[PDB]
Symmetry: D2
């Protein structure tokens, strides 16, 4: 049934998404065509449970959607990937009352969700965040700022971490759902980036941002716990994204090298090139299987998830650098897509925990 | 599958691991492993149940090979070569011939070898020179083979020989040869880098007459059957490599936690932590791709995935075992610890059942199809 | 002596080139400030012999100039690197009469030179070029086109290879000096590129382009020999450029990781980060030494030059990918330069012969 | 001068050393033929200053000798590499009076020297050594033990580090010349090893080993400082050894792949093989140039470059020798050819004279200073 799912999303991606991926990048503009196609086909947030009108897709299927979209446009693949990132905490730990306000809109395609953890002085060290939430009667008052927020300015709902008790450290962070129209909440300017150019990446500001008491996810002081829980059920989807990029770059190189002739023969006739292609495909398949395994394990209940994400992203970086190479001069131009794929691949090694952090998680598990 | 793993690991750690050092040091057959594998029925679990076998699925067979290789790679070649030396027969042999051979392999009474390579026909196996000529209702084998794993310990041998020099690879046939067939002899063993205890021998055929029913499938399909065999066996060498790497990593985690320099375990250093993470991450990717390739082989382009799984796992093992020696420091460079042997053993996995260059030829041909 | 030279070029590069490098990339425009500073300091073409008013510098000194410029702006470094690429053939084999017309202007900074070998269907396989030259009276008539031409539209002089006898293969190719003002010579559109964005990269067209008989370089039929000789004396300079990029990336990462704190300490206090920095610096220094050795050997009169170029560029691709990684999220933005350095490093593996071609060259020598 | 030196050592090594290398390794016995030839040709310790009867060769020339010996026999290359390691401290910091006693014998080939720093609990963390030296009138009494000692049992002179003040940490360590005939000094059993098998690698024991006051190198408490300075001047020579091993591996692979024919053509006719050969040679030359640069700078008047030269070259040798075994296929995995031994030998170069993890500590400290 994943065979059929893959055929469906690939057909959708190639027809409605792929033709605009070069513009989305070149012009650094939101992938609107992709959003419309994902929303109307119901592929924008398949992970949302059926109870809220979602597909209730299993975790492997969700990875397959992200991977197949990323295979033609990595900025577009951040629509389903951050929809998951921005709703996973709520799903796992949120109250039914809160879930009902948010999930049906994400499930139906009416709203996107973003995830707001990071701050200028708190990236890898997320627990040193400075944004705070102070109770005030029935409300929470948010003050501070966040940065690196994917789909900032396009999302309707934001999962936002803030300090509710500074003296409890990691155990004094809470998570809140913030709506875009909430007073005191503003979206900052977009970053200029190496790749995923069309994906808006913004600062956010909270100046006495008053939100209802029902917006808190779980008990106060459980926000960091929830952040870690979020990442366990999302890191493989960034692995799936890296796998898709890699696959698209390999697909392009195979097609091009077969058709491009030098020395009176296809450049793919040269065993140096054949071996490079083999190495790219071998590692992509290994990375894909570890992604799916990590995803299936997460669903059923740190090592495998960090591994799947670290490995697939390392693989995508090598594969896309090789794919640019196999096109020769044309690979270095915007006329072909592999140049964009290479710039996009680099982010997968950085967000949803840097690959150095993934190695920290992995080694801690091995050595415990 | 978990219960299988627990059972084979216990046997390997209890009955095989204590002899692994001496197996290598003396370059002598792992007899203790053979007795334990044979009597607990772990030596050839792939043989179909119709012939007295466990009829285990191909992933189960990989897990057995992997868990044995984790403690002794020479020993792992008992089940791995039991499979190599019977797979052609299982795939393409007649009931009449299968019934003669497989029950003894199924029971642990007989090991099987696979005799394909010659001095001048390694990668280019189709250029082999050993001949088979039809005589009445018999075949007369003349020639020699080399690099034959478990040579001199095996009872049954799958031998390829030319039936028609004119027909190229379409003029190769495959035959089951028995240790007691007259004019069949075993030559000297190779002096090797690793898997030192696995006998690796030449074989001689001197007017070696065998019954006509010994042929596997039709005359001239022997190379085709050789290629199909590798499709179904390449992942098991992947599994072997995964096992070796796992054992090297297990030894390095245990040792780096215990060994202290500068007032703390050597594992306390982030450079060592990252290297351990790299080892484990890559081992798990290799493992999953081995099991996937095995699952797909059993169900019926296995070409790409089986070559991939063998090539990647063996590359991973080489890197992991090189690292594990490194993590022990000077002790890792001594025979006092097993990681030195593990490194030496890991190297063969990149070479046999198709060198990793040949694996890349198979993979790229599939992609460029 | 070279120490003094390195100090001078570095000071020049820091003060007059570096402040414009971001803008040169972001606006994809020619590094005009770098041109003015290099021309007036006399750093634009120091390889030109003294006989023509040039500096007459040794080949290592030329590499150090290219390296130190590439350390702050790769597009800018193509000024001296392609001034060299576009005059070496002439210098090695051209008549005195021809050299007197071209070289003094390049030496004085009045003219830039370009090198025009490649065509759409003749890249790695340059010998299959289709641009034609036909003798007509005392002149040559050139017809056809070239592409990938660095500094196209900015150069005054172009070294152009063309077929003079179609039946002689590589031995029926000649090389000619073409002047930007020659009738029937026109410059095409600029490529849109992954990196080195400010370096113009253009098609050229020859439409009954009539040039004097004195424009041929050496004897008819020796043009390809002269192209191969050029690469022998230029490939180490692309190694030098890749060393420069890598060094700038490493300088950046050292400065940033010392100042950026997470978990209460500089990120450079992590041993994984320390080891990565050690790896970058070790490979850079190996690459640098092999470049200078190739340069010294070429100048005193295939393997070492191909090795110096392949190795340094593979190193720079690795080092710049790591430098982006070590800046974390900031590395992925245009606010810092490591992202530009990564995009730029990729070209070094492709031009003046792809690293695959370099391995053809090397293995042929080993196996001779 | 260097072109000629290289030619002279290469010819000597090919004639007098190469023919014995396989036996030295296989039988784990000292390379006696190489010692005799290096001694009588005057190549055993060319770094020794002219003032003590030595050749007084520059540091690049000393690397070239070590490199070209290592190219055919790594164990034999440890004669001049360790003759340098076990005298450099003395040369740099010792009194004229002591130098005159030790250096002429090393210069003339009458004596080998060893370096005795490491202990079972003091490897990377050498400053935590436990061997003590106690003053007794004008003399010193040594008590403790060393391990990992190359050429132990063969050397005549040993540079030994010992604690002279347990309260001063690293500044409580001293260095002493110990003679093989000093009473209370004994040599323990040899390690069994992955490679450099013919190189003796021993424990040493000091039991009330009384030595004269003139045997101390430099002032008391500066022995560890002397250890660090020594490594600055010797690390490139292990880079040079790794470069020789890799060069021998590459040379062997070139000659072999050109002559081994499969599929109707030399195996070197395949581009995947050509490219690997190209990668091997390119990295070897980069490694060589950095070693010579490191050596040349050490001589002139260094932390970063000596560590980089050794780390890079040893990493290169490990990759290159793993590749060279691969390129021989089956034959590479056998003792019939030398690439298997070269592979085993390469591994030590990443470990001794400071592991490559320690080299990265040293490099990164210099970068972040
Ligand atoms: C385009 C884009 C998009 C997103 C994001 C980033 C970017 C660039 N992120 C933020 C992302 O998760 C974040 O960038 C990483 O956690 C890394 O943090 P810093 O950028 O602060 O680097 P930081 O300063 O943490 O790291 C600097 C370098 O040091 C290394 N390092 C740090 N600690 C180390 C340690 N203990 N050991 C070894 N090395 C260590 C790092 O690996 C890195 O190489 C995000 N966030 C969010 O909340 N919502 C979002 O939607 C997104 N989306
Ligand atoms: C920005 C920029 C700037 C310049 C240039 C290019 C670019 C992109 N070049 C042209 C450059 O030298 C050219 O891109 C390369 O020679 C490769 O040619 P193709 O782009 O046609 O790739 P091509 O189609 O040759 O190669 C495609 C792939 O096949 C591989 N391949 C080809 N043959 C192979 C073989 N036999 N064995 C193994 N692999 C093989 C290649 O390595 C590559 O990965 C140039 N030119 C010029 O005349 N003047 C200039 O100034 C410049 N400058
Ligand atoms: C210990 C041991 C155990 C066994 C075996 C070997 C060994 C060493 N073998 C034999 C094994 O399968 C054989 O060694 C390989 O197929 C390679 O053949 P050669 O050793 O002749 O190397 P060969 O000479 O074919 O290869 C030499 C080098 O050239 C490369 N090469 C060759 N052709 C190439 C091409 N077209 N493109 C790129 N590169 C190419 C190879 O990759 C290798 O690097 C075997 N056999 C058997 O019948 N029964 C058994 O039980 C075993 N077991
Ligand atoms: C054959 C042979 C020959 C010689 C030598 C060894 C051998 C095997 N040695 C000793 C050698 O120098 C010694 O093995 C190394 O210094 C490493 O010490 P240990 O073996 O105790 O490993 P140790 O236990 O120190 O290291 C184990 C692992 O931990 C790692 N590690 C340790 N500290 C670390 C840190 N701070 N950060 C990151 N990683 C760290 C190491 O890199 C290694 O990977 C020697 N000695 C001598 O005195 N005279 C001699 O002649 C020779 N000869």
């Amino acid at each position: 049934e994943h065979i059929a799912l893959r055929e469906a999303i690939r057909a959708l991606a190639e027809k409605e998404i792929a033709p605009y991926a070069a513009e989305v990048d070149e012009k650094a503009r939101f992938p609107e065509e992709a959003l419309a196609a994902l929303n109307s086909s119901g592929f924008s947030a398949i992970h949302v449970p059926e109870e809220y009108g979602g597909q209730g897709a299993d975790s492997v299927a969700t990875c397959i959607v992200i991977e197949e979209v990323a295979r033609v446009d990595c900025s577009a693949s951040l629509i389903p990937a951050v929809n998951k990132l921005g709703t996973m905490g709520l799903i796992l730990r949120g109250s039914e009352e809160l879930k009902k306000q948010v999930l049906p809109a994400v499930a139906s395609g009416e709203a996107m969700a973003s995830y707001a953890l990071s701050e200028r002085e708190a990236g890898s060290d997320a627990a040193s965040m400075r944004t705070r939430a102070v109770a005030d009667g029935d409300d929470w008052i948010l003050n501070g700022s966040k940065c690196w927020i994917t789909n900032g300015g396009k999302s309707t709902w934001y999962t936002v971490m803030a300090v509710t008790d500074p003296d409890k450290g990691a155990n004094g962070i809470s998570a809140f759902m913030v709506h875009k129209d909430d007073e005191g909440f503003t979206v900052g300017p977009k970053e200029r980036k190496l790749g995923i150019k069309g994906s808006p990446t913004t600062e956010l500001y909270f100046e006495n941002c008053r939100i209802p008491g029902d917006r808190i996810i779980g008990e106060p002081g459980t926000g960091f716990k929830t952040a870690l829980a979020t990442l366990d059920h999302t890191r493989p989807t960034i692995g799936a994204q890296a796998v898709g990029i890699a696959q698209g770059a390999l697909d392009a190189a195979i097609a091009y090298t077969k058709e491009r002739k030098q020395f009176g023969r296809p450049v793919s006739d040269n065993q140096g090139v054949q071996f490079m292609l083999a190495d790219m495909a071998m590692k992509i398949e290994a990375a894909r299987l570890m992604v799916y395994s990590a995803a299936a394990r997460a669903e059923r209940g740190g090592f495998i998830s960090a591994a799947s994400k670290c490995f697939a992203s390392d693989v995508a970086m090598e594969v896309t650098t090789d794919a640019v190479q196999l096109f020769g001069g044309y690979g270095y131009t915007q006329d072909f897509p592999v140049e964009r794929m290479m710039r996009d691949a680099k982010i997968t090694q950085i967000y949803e925990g840097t690959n150095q952090i993934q190695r920290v998680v992995m080694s801690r598990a091995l050595l415990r």
